[PDB]
Swiss-Prot record, chain A:
Belongs to the peptidase M48 family. BepA subfamily. Binds 1 zinc ion per subunit. The keyword tRNA processing does not apply. The gene is bepA. The lineage of its organism: Bacteria, Pseudomonadati, Pseudomonadota, Gammaproteobacteria, Enterobacterales. GO terms for cellular component: membrane; outer membrane-bounded periplasmic space. This is Beta-barrel assembly-enhancing protease. It comes from Escherichia coli (strain K12). Keywords: Hydrolase, Metal-binding, Metalloprotease, Periplasm, Protease, Repeat, Signal, TPR repeat, Zinc.
Length: 415, 416, 418
């Protein structure tokens, strides 16, 4: 209902985001961000909607949310987050904006294209909340933040770490424009945090690796994985130090020095052959120097290949670079149906259907990528081509034409 | 004006074709329009062309709208015991148009789409149009006069009306025909009086009627519209026309059940007696192509007397050429056909198949566009023609043709 | 010596089960033996029962050994354009055994029994390999084509297949492994054309079981070059009505593989509506229903089949449906009868183990698992399971004596061979 209307608007805005904002669609980073975000939602109160967490390639710090439990986070959050609980505090803040329906209340009381044009401007390299909205979001946030097993003091520590940067810097962090931070708010955040018991929690090994991949592979402007940080991480706790070798191998591979990335990756590969993170890096090193087969053999022998979308996409791509397009199609035809919103699967499906010379299937896989990006007229154009290369009355013609109808009914709902 | 309702009639027909289950069989649409135009031939104050559509729906109903477009549910064939009763339903609808009953109903009134959605719901098997008793009184009086001038039995209208009332007088929910067309006793009584007042005329239902009934009930099987062997057993004892149609009906079901050898020898006696009959020639091609004897189907149709004049024979021979591996000959016929019958989607689809086999892709896309345009999917048709226009040289004649047709389809969109 | 060879053949198939990737799918195994036995029924001097095995291997090969056991690599469905090509290869193998070529070849030499088994396992596994003389291959072709035509297949399908093998041994650098076991010099090819030309032309249409088998093999058991490609399905969509239905089946199968259950139901719907009693469509409709947690709908459809008491495919399908439906006792009643009537079918023993596991009858589950291990030649493991099963029942009980008795049989089977 109003849940239905708001999830319909949520999808429209997510499509607009995908079409203009620079989202990181990395399988590992998308998986981590959503697995961490769901962990907070499962401990939140009054959840009416599914939740999805999006990552922008933007070195300006910002976080916001809109209808349908869609939370969008700038990758610069990893630069500011010293630990996983800090990053979780910002997400818990955003989920609390959603559970309180702060944005819904404002627009209800007193335009769809006007609000959507602001959401794209905030993500691309404005909405503002009252001081009661921010007060509600911090408390409800910190309560769901520690029921999730994170450090409650991380929220005031991150806020005060935000306030200190705003005072000295030429221009304030853009997140402080969407979420204003008077000293009154920080003092209130310190009060409720101090009211609970101290909790020193170790950040997940997945957090340190995500921050390494976010800053090393998706570097941009101030979002660099500096040699200072890694020399610093080489001296740290048990989880931080192997995250060091991972990021070191990353840019050795980024700079096309693949032989250097092999020797750095060796010990973590040999020690942990069953986790997706170095398996993923252990596919890119192999395909970069035309060693596709053992990258396939390595992924064929993986345990959680039939459980983890990251290994499936990695192995599908390896089959493509290995000259076996059909094996890639077999995986991707099932992946696209179980991961309807993952534009990586649709793109790889199109690449495989292109290599098999199945033109209408290629055009159809391309169309789903264009529909996900809000380019409905363009997706309809591709399906019309697809429908024109199969015989009328066939199973494929009825499918392509029915899909055109769906996209046309989706289009009129807002136009 | 009249130009808009003819144009609005085309709009409703297009979205009817795109979603209602219309029967596109060459013989059936040729018969029902031939019978319908014969009635228009004797109607007064006709200001529009007329077209008659057949819908696969076992619920009996009939209605008409702007542009002289009459819609008939296939169930009318099982209710009509003779040809004059079926014509009685058409003359009723025809009079609804010449009196412009629905037109004035919509003059006293998102309004076009509101009625389009209603017409579409009435047509599909699964907010409905109803006419006033005055409109229905006029539609029977003028309708029975059109029906007498056309050389049928005027008494078929009240017998039909009494047939349906005798069956639906007691039902909680009568058939949909009586909701659109309310039949109190007063309207029946007046219908029977005016029929009694003119002259008696005993007419025999044309041969074409009995085989149209057999094919409608036979090939377009669905639900209560099966042709039970009960009707075929009865027709085997009826008049000379009903016994032939009975054996044509079971030759039809033998072919439906892939009993091709049974179907040939069952159709055997009828084809020998009337070797130039379209109904028998049509069925013989179905049997021949089902046994991969395309050559035999071609030679028979090439020797057909009125192949050069009858659209049913042209389509059958064009399709046989296709199954025979001669796409060029099929295209030679279909190019002539599609320009002689611009609204026939059977012609356009077969031409698309021929042009695909010939690998003339821009001509194939152009033919495919017409099928999509006739079904109300104008954007899709415009898309195909844009592809066709992109595969011809700039400044070429073909490019000017495709671009000009896109303009016609685009202009047809902006009217609604 | 027939008694020795048929027990020696049992040892080899046990060794095949335990190491080669055999396709145990009920429909496919039933088809390949239905057609194989149809050729044996028209063969001469048959002294042995016959079983045909399907290996999930994309390299084309076929071979046969003692006890009338013929092994067929699933690649054969990729090379076979018609049912008579497939039968031509099977008749060739059936001709190898009735002439006892492998038996007569090994009487010349005399440890050795296991050296032959390692060769057989290496040929079967995808990954020292037996090859026949030119005399043997001539006999197997001459005798085979006569069996092939007595069975109502196209005799010209034998020379047409042989040349198809040669035509891609020159196109590719790869020589098909079938031609390493069964050498194909041009003398043999000319001989095959000659014997076929002496017989009368026969246009036979393939059974619709062949196209569905080809569809199920390449679509459900796809591997390497064995794929049910869109190119194949498009050509079947343009062919005769049997290929059109099989193309509809194959696409429904692949939708089911990809969890597109509602799409798969709409695709199978016209085929199952046309023949509601067809095992291939009944089988697929069950997979679709169980995929959507619709066991009751799956159970009810299979109880309405005529051949439920006669067709082993429907029996296993319904036992598994009962399993997913939370009725394991009803599954066990089917499988207790099945495993008694089909002692050598590993599917029955595995599903019975699942049913006894679901009923918390641990010793009966262990004994069922043991049969699966014994059929795969893992006799010590099967003895280990039966020993543990015997340890959960009372001494002097009827169950104790049976578990111990079967241990005795398995150990007695161990000392006959090394
Ligand atoms: Zn906020
Ligand atoms: Zn009326
Ligand atoms: Zn041989």
């Amino acid at each position: 209902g109003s849940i239905g209307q708001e999830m319909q608007m949520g999808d429209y805005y997510v499509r607009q985001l995908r079409g203009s904002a620079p989202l990181i669609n990395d399988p590992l980073l998308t998986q981590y961000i959503n697995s961490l975000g769901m962990r907070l939602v499962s401990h939140a109160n009054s959840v009416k909607t599914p939740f999805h967490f999006f990552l922008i390639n933007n070195d300006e710090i910002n976080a916001f949310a809109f209808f349908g439990g869609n939370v969008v986070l700038h990758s610069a959050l990893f630069r500011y987050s010293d630990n996983e609980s800090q990053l979780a505090s910002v997400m818990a803040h955003e989920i609390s904006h959603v559970t309180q329906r702060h944005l819904a209340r404002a627009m209800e009381d007193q335009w769809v294209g006007a609000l959507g044009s602001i959401l794209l401007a905030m993500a691309s390299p404005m909405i503002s909340f009252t001081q009661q909205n921010e007060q509600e979001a911090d408390r409800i946030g910190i309560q769901v933040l520690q029921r999730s097993g994170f450090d409650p003091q991380a929220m005031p520590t991150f806020l005060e770490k935000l306030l200190d940067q705003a005072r000295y810097s030429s221009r304030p962090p853009e997140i402080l424009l969407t979420h204003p931070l008077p000293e009154s708010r920080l003092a209130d955040a310190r009060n409720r945090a101090n009211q609970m018991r101290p909790m020193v929690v170790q950040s997940s090994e997945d957090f340190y690796l995500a921050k390494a991949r976010t800053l090393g592979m998706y570097n941009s402007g101030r979002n660099q994985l500096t040699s200072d940080l890694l020399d610093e991480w080489a001296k740290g706790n048990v989880r931080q130090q192997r995250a060091a070798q991972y990021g070191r191998a990353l840019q050795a591979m980024e700079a096309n020095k693949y032989d250097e990335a092999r020797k750095t990756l060796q010990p973590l590969l040999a020690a942990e052959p069953g986790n997706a993170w170095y398996l993923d890096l252990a596919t890119d090193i192999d395909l970069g120097q035309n060693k596709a087969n053992e990258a396939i053999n390595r992924l064929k022998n993986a345990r959680d290949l039939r459980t983890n979308p990251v290994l499936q996409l990695n192995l599908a791509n390896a089959y493509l670079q290995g000259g076996q397009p059909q094996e890639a199609a077999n995986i991707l035809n099932r992946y696209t149906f179980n991961n309807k919103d993952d534009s990586n699967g649709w793109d790889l499906l199109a690449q495989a259907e292109a290599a098999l010379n199945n033109r209408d299937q290629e055009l159809a896989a391309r169309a789903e990528g264009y529909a996900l990006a809000g380019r409905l007229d363009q997706a309809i154009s591709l399906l019309s081509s697809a429908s024109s290369q199969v015989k009328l009355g066939s199973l494929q013609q009825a499918r392509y034409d029915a899909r055109i109808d769906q996209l046309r009914q989706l289009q009129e709902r807002f136009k």
